[PDB]
Amino acid sequence: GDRINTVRGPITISEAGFTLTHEHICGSSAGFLRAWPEFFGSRKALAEKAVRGLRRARAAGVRTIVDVSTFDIGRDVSLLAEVSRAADVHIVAATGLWFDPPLSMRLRSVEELTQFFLREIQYGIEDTGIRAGIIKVATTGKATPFQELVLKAAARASLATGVPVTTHTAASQRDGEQQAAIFESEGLSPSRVCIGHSDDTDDLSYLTALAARGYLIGLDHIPHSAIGLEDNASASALLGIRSWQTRALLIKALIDQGYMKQILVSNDWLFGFSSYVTNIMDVMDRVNPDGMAFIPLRVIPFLREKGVPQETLAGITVTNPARFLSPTLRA
Amino acid sequence: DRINTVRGPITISEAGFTLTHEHICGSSAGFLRAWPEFFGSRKALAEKAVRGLRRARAAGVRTIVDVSTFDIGRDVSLLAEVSRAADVHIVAATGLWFDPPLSMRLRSVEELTQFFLREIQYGIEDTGIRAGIIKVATTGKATPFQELVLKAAARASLATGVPVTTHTAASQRDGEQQAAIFESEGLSPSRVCIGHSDDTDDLSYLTALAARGYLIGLDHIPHSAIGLEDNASASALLGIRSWQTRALLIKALIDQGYMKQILVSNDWLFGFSSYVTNIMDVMDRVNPDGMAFIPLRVIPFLREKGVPQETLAGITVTNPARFLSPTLRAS
Ligand SMILES: OCCc1ccccc1
Ligand SMILES: OCCc1ccccc1
Ligand SMILES: [Mn+2]
Ligand SMILES: [Mn+2]
Numbered sequence: 001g002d003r004i005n006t007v008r009g010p011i012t013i014s015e016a017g018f019t020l021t022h023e024h025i026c027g028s029s030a031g032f033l034r035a036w037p038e039f040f041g042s043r044k045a046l047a048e049k050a051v052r053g054l055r056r057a058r059a060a061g062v063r064t065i066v067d068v069s070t071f072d073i074g075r076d077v078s079l080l081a082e083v084s085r086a087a088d089v090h091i092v093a094a095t096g097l098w099f100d101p102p103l104s105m106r107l108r109s110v111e112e113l114t115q116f117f118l119r120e121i122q123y124g125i126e127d128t129g130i131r132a133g134i135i136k137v138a139t140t141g142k143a144t145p146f147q148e149l150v151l152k153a154a155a156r157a158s159l160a161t162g163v164p165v166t167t168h169t170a171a172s173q174r175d176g177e178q179q180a181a182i183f184e185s186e187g188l189s190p191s192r193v194c195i196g197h198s199d200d201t202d203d204l205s206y207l208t209a210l211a212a213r214g215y216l217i218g219l220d221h222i223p224h225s226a227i228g229l230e231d232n233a234s235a236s237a238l239l240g241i242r243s244w245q246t247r248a249l250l251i252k253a254l255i256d257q258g259y260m261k262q263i264l265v266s267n268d269w270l271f272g273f274s275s276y277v278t279n280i281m282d283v284m285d286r287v288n289p290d291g292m293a294f295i296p297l298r299v300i301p302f303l304r305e306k307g308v309p310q311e312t313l314a315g316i317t318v319t320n321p322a323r324f325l326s327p328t329l330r331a
Numbered sequence: 332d333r334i335n336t337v338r339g340p341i342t343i344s345e346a347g348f349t350l351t352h353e354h355i356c357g358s359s360a361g362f363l364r365a366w367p368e369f370f371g372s373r374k375a376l377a378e379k380a381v382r383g384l385r386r387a388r389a390a391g392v393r394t395i396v397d398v399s400t401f402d403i404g405r406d407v408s409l410l411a412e413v414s415r416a417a418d419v420h421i422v423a424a425t426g427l428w429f430d431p432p433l434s435m436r437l438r439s440v441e442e443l444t445q446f447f448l449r450e451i452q453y454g455i456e457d458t459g460i461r462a463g464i465i466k467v468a469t470t471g472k473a474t475p476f477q478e479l480v481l482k483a484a485a486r487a488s489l490a491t492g493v494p495v496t497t498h499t500a501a502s503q504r505d506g507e508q509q510a511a512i513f514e515s516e517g518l519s520p521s522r523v524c525i526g527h528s529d530d531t532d533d534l535s536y537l538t539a540l541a542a543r544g545y546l547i548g549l550d551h552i553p554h555s556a557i558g559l560e561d562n563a564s565a566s567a568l569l570g571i572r573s574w575q576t577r578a579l580l581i582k583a584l585i586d587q588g589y590m591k592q593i594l595v596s597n598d599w600l601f602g603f604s605s606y607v608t609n610i611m612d613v614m615d616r617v618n619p620d621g622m623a624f625i626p627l628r629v630i631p632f633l634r635e636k637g638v639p640q641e642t643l644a645g646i647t648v649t650n651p652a653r654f655l656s657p658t659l660r661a662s
């Protein structure tokens with residue numbers, strides 16, 4: 001693969017640069033932003049907030065972000081394109097299905113879902129021509145029957161297009177294993193797959209075993225932590241009580257185990273968030289004022305301090321994402 | 332003195348013969364725009380709807396109430412386009428059915444009240460097309476979230492005068508619990524239509540609600556799986572009662588003295604993604620008359636059963652007008 005699709009069109013692999021592989025402009029629901037923009041103040045407000053945030057990550061060195069919002073996460077491709085242009089940051093859009101598919105999606109066959117993911121990757125999202133550059137799927141423990149279909153279609157779409165698959169997992173419950181199993185049963189190469197939210201578990205055995213099989217490990221919840229918000233139940237349930245340092249150390253752990261080439265790091269950040277309790281955005285923003293710039297501003301330096309060499313840091317933030325994102329077909 | 336339609340306000344007299352429970356398309360939020368090909372094409376769907384609407388219009392139908400909420404995938408722009416092309420008044424709805432995504436399910440009664448008000452008072456999305464009715468629903472005992480929706484719908488009705496219409500599990504007598512919730516909010520039964528009432532032969536249930544002042548929605552008349560007993564999905568959706576059995580409910584209610592509380596419709600559609608693939612073809616085979624079924628078959632049937640002309644006119648013109656007319660409670 002020589003080109004990556006973005007909301008502004010295709011870019012060469014070199015242009016991706018420093019990339020955050022699991023982010024979001026807005027965490028919502030299909031049709032939500034268009035139907036009730038005031039939930040976020042306004043569309044304009046949300047976009048402005050987004051541009052500010054993207055500009056700041058950009059100042060910090062982020063060149064590209066992969067917005068893993070699916071149809072069901074309320075991905076609004078027009079919004080992504082507008083802010084990408086305004087902030088001058090590349091944004092890779094996604095196809096796939098998250099865990100909140102409406103009936104029209106939930107009643108579909110693997111064949112049907114495959115054609116829909118294909119539509120989004122090959123032709124374009126909605127009527128925009130904006131093509132997806134990644135497939136997002138998810139499980140939250142053992143897969144439901146529908147989710148197994150989603151996983152299968154995702155693999156089929158990946159096999160046909162060469163674009164990678166990235167996932168949401170209930171890390172502590174080892175969902176990556178079931179995911180992998182399904183992917184493999186469809187003939188997908190582990191190298192086209194990123195098992196996400198992997199920093200949510202302290203089980204290094206689980207992660208190294210997956211890495212050992214060739215999977216990419218997404219350590220994408222680094223700044224997520226409710227330490228200092230124990231009183232806030234929902235926030236606690238969302239962010240956990242492990243420190244950012246603890247999560248970040250997993251990156252070092254995997255590097256020390258020999259898997260530096262299989263690590264993807266991000267913040268799983270957003271500018272609007274409707275798919276959870278009201279006011280959770282404010283809470284998050286308090287917890288992590290750096291937002292998407294958290295990786296380059298705090299994690300990179302923390303790792304270097306811990307002994308990780310520059311070249312390794314560079315490989316993880318630049319080389320890894322480039323290899324992953326480059327559309328690659330099975331030989 | 333005015334009813335809001337997708338083409339603007341109309342005078343109570345312009346509504347004429349009205350179908351109070353219909354859909355242009357039965358889908359999911361954002362589905363039609365993300366995967367129009369599911370219906371062949373957006374253009375195909377529009378044309379189909381225009382043909383059907385022209386045909387019902389030929390039959391005497393002047394207005395249809397499209398009870399598709401945000402979660403049924405209502406696409407007001409499509410409603411407007413087809414209304415204009417077929418020259419049939421179409422009343423849009425707000426409310427929430429039974430497939431709300433997370434962004435909706437996590438909301439409070441207060442937030443949902445503001446969303447329903449936005450759609451009624453200001454406009455749907457950015458179109459300024461104002462909803463003329465509030466659609467809600469339960470499928471058996473209401474869920475906690477569903478109770479909140481019913482309460483918000485009552486609040487919105489009390490503030491705007493726009494009526495509330497519901498989807499029920501007639502079998503389970505959902506209408507009683509709905510009425511309960513509505514009344515606890517101070518809503519007048521005369522602003523409420525208890526839907527899919529013809530799905531049950533319990534004349535006790537129906538007359539008990541009519542007695543309190545509710546409007547009874549006999550809108551599934553043409554739904555019958557007779558002759559397709561072998562199609563599990565269809566029988567499940569359509570039932571095995573004949574259209575005449577359902578229609579006879581109208582006469583029964585008339586006979587029991589509640590002719591002013593009856594609303595009749597077909598609950599038809601031109602696209603249906605929220606169910607198994609091909610259901611639309613099965614339905615169209617069952618009732619080729621589509622929306623025209625009420626005037627072409629239902630009205631004449633009743634008339635032959637002794638129902639008088641003026642009562643027929645009363646039910647099809649008078650009742651809907653009174654129901655649709657925004658009405659604020661006395662103070
Ligand atoms: O040898 C290549 C150096 C590199 C480091 C970490 C991950 C990607 C590449
Ligand atoms: O005035 C009696 C005429 C009428 C009959 C049916 C429904 C509403 C009105
Ligand atoms: Mn996630
Ligand atoms: Mn995410």
Ligand SMILES: [Mn+2]
Binds near residue numbers: 498499527
């Ligand atoms: Mn219904």
Ligand SMILES: [Mn+2]
Binds near residue numbers: 353354398598
């Ligand atoms: Mn309906």
Ligand code: NA
Binds near residue numbers: 121
């Ligand atoms: Na493509």
Ligand code: NA
Binds near residue numbers: 450452461462
């Ligand atoms: Na209004």
